[PDB]
Nucleic acid binder design. Sequence first.
DNA 1: AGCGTGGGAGGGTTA
DNA 2: TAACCCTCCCACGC
Length: 117
Amino acid sequence: MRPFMCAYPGCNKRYFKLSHLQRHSRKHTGEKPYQCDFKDCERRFSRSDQLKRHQRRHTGVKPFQCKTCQRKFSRSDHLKTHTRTHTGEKPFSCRWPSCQKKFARSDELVRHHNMHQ
DNA sequence: AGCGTGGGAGGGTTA
DNA sequence: TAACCCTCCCACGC
Ligand SMILES: [Zn+2]
Ligand SMILES: [Zn+2]
Ligand SMILES: [Zn+2]
Ligand SMILES: [Zn+2]
């Protein structure tokens, strides 16, 4: 399954790719060489992709646009869940007894599940 | 309730 | 040999 296993004592985390393991290894070492050099910000990241995603907050760039209402979004995963507001898709159904409510996002189902109990 | 929108994280592809 | 792009998990706020 996962041939790349973390060698840190007690971690026991395994990965499919070596790049995934080397990316995880910075969690133990704590190195965050990708600092944000914008003013009034001290955010640091161990990954370059997380820094550039964060720096969209400073630049205001929204590269992902909804083809229905033309609204732009900073992140592609948030455009995907926004599209369900137009299509009405709710792929996450509550499995509580007698309940039939469905939700477009998983965190909405988790919040609804916590309301049952 | 429904949904915008961050960080943290793991999947993938690519010279 | 990591940068790059993707969605998910979890969280916070209105
Ligand atoms: Zn580890
Ligand atoms: Zn910043
Ligand atoms: Zn839209
Ligand atoms: Zn329910």
